Amino acid sequence: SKGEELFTGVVPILVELDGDVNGHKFSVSGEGEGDATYGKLTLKFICTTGKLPVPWPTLVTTFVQCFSRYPDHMKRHDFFKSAMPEGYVQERTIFFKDDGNYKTRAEVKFEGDTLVNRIELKGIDFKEDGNILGHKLEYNYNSDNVYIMADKQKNGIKVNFKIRHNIEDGSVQLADHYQQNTPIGDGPVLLPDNHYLSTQSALSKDPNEKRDHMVLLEFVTAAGI
Numbered sequence: 001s002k003g004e005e006l007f008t009g010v011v012p013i014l015v016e017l018d019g020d021v022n023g024h025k026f027s028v029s030g031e032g033e034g035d036a037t038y039g040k041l042t043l044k045f046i047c048t049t050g051k052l053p054v055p056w057p058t059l060v061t062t063f064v065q066c067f068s069r070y071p072d073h074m075k076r077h078d079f080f081k082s083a084m085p086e087g088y089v090q091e092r093t094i095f096f097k098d099d100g101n102y103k104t105r106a107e108v109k110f111e112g113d114t115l116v117n118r119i120e121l122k123g124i125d126f127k128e129d130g131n132i133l134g135h136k137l138e139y140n141y142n143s144d145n146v147y148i149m150a151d152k153q154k155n156g157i158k159v160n161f162k163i164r165h166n167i168e169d170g171s172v173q174l175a176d177h178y179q180q181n182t183p184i185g186d187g188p189v190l191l192p193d194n195h196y197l198s199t200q201s202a203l204s205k206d207p208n209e210k211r212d213h214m215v216l217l218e219f220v221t222a223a224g225i
Helices: 003-007 072-077
Strands: 011-021 024-035 040-047 088-096 101-111 114-124 146-151 156-166 172-183 195-204 213-223
Touching (some): 011 040
Antiparallel strands (some): 024 040, 040 213, 146 156, 146 195, 156 172, 195 213
16 A cells, blocks of 8 residues: 555654653653554553552553554555555544543654654542552563454444453453554545454563663564454
């Protein structure tokens, strides 16, 4: 499509988030690069305001699905790159079961040769000593497919999926994601048939980094068609 050509090589990525969860305000800056040819993302996030007041794993999905590898036979279904470079708005509600919710509004677009994800996050109705504000989640990440359908009325897409965060006691903290993406430009975009993204994420730490941070390595492939 349009932006598909913008992703044939390695693209630098910047992520900027401002958050407020139950009145706890924080900002995060991330940098890395993506290589959509391999569905590959490498990112490092730093909390610039001090200690992150929620667990890092709960922000992975908020912190650029244009880097997904769409198989050649599935190229007409790749909404995300088709909206580039002008980009898209990505909005979610993330419901943490028996706890609060995040609402996020993000704009994903090129600034020059750099793909930028700018996010505002608002979290409300969290429990003071629940799994999120009480930091009871393991620093790890599992799988789960991301389901995408057309929203042929907002000329965008609707995405739904579940994340299961691991609680330190061996249980699971469900995070139900509801997502909508809509192009920023007027340009034509690709409205896909139903399909899913297969995702894998690995979380790590930089041994030399003394700020609160997360290193993220992810691989994403479109499938289901």
